[PDB]
């Protein structure tokens, strides 16, 4: 608190950057006016459950991406939001077992 | 030559039915206990709101918190106070 020195300030730098971290970002997702219980109110049907099981749904069953690669919830996404060599690594959302 | 080939078929089917009965035993244990989903979510919140079953992410030895009740919760509970 009282004093910050070159070595200690650089320690702060590497610790903060290792905690935190041509585009390769996720494809943007717009707002969603049809939501299933409140918004659109679909009576329980069947197309929605078959889409949530088998197909690709980019807001529900995974995160899509530029360069095309699909990632569902149990996988870890490697990206690079900056123009550097440092890569963001989004951890899995679920982490089964 | 009947015996040896019947034996190797017996052994392969034995390992197959053994692993299958392992999975069936686990399914039958899962059949015994079936809980509503919101009870599982609520209990998971009570078990991991404070770090009781999984450690805090920045923990160094000498930190006071522990996965057991702790000395302070024991000395401040009904058990420690109301009898003494």
């Amino acid at each position: 608190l009282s004093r910050n020195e070159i070595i200690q300030s650089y320690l702060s730098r590497q610790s903060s950057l290792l905690s935190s971290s041509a585009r390769q970002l996720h494809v943007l997702v717009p707002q969603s006016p049809p939501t299933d219980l409140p918004g659109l109110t679909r009576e329980v049907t069947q197309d929605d459950l078959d889409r949530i099981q088998a197909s690709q749904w980019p807001g529900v069953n995974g995160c899509q991406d530029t360069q095309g690669n699909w990632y569902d919830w149990t996988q870890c996404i490697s990206l690079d939001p900056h123009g550097d060599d440092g890569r963001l690594n989004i951890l899995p959302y679920v982490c089964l077992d | 030559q009947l015996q040896k080939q019947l034996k190797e078929a017996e052994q392969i089917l034995a390992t197959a039915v053994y692993q299958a009965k392992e999975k069936l035993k686990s399914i039958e244990k899962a059949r015994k206990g079936a809980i509503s989903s919101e009870e599982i979510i609520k209990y998971a919140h009570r078990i991991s709101a404070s770090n009781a079953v999984c450690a805090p992410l920045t923990w160094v030895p000498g930190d006071p918190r522990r996965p057991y009740p702790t000395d302070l919760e024991m000395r401040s509970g009904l058990l420690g106070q109301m009898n003494n």
Binding site: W73 | A9, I12, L13, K23
Partner: protein, 161 residues
């Protein structure tokens, strides 16, 4: 620390004289030191204690991006406070202000925590289902092989006879 001694004195007996388990409590208890009354919401609302900046449109991702940008712009305005008039009243408000913003950025993403919880149950069930079918198919293939194995050995035996 102590040991409930009256009930352990009760337990040493025979016949039906030992005691039954207590009934389940559906109201305020006093475990530990907190109360932990039942029927609590997992995420207690923000309207109980602090202000609320966001309406019921509540489309979580847009408001999280809004709160990120609001945190950065209020940091820049705090820098404008420190440049222009450090003795102003507003900095105290400002040093409160972004605090409230930070609270909301935590309070929205805690609302992803039940959802995440429910969602991990869903994928666990899917994986569970898939593994069952895989073992079924695995076993059936083994069954088929054993059958044809027996068959060809039976196909060998009249050829010895």
């Amino acid at each position: 620390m102590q040991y409930i001694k009256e009930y352990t004195d009760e337990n040493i007996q025979e016949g039906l004289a030992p005691k039954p388990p207590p009934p389940i409590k559906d109201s305020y208890m006093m475990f530990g030191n907190q109360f932990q009354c039942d029927d609590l919401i997992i995420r207690p609302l923000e309207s109980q204690g602090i202000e609320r900046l966001h309406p019921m449109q509540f489309d979580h991702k847009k408001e999280l991006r809004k709160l990120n940008m609001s945190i950065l712009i209020n940091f820049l305005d705090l820098l404008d406070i420190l440049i222009r008039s450090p003795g102003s009243i507003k900095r105290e408000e400002k040093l409160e202000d972004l605090k409230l913003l930070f609270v909301h950025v935590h309070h929205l993403i805690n609302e992803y925590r039940p959802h995440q919880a429910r969602e991990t149950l869903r994928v666990m069930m899917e994986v569970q289902k898939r593994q069952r079918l895989e073992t079924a198919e695995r076993f059936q293939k083994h069954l088929e092989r054993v059958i044809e194995m027996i068959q060809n050995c039976l196909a060998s035996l009249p050829d010895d006879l």
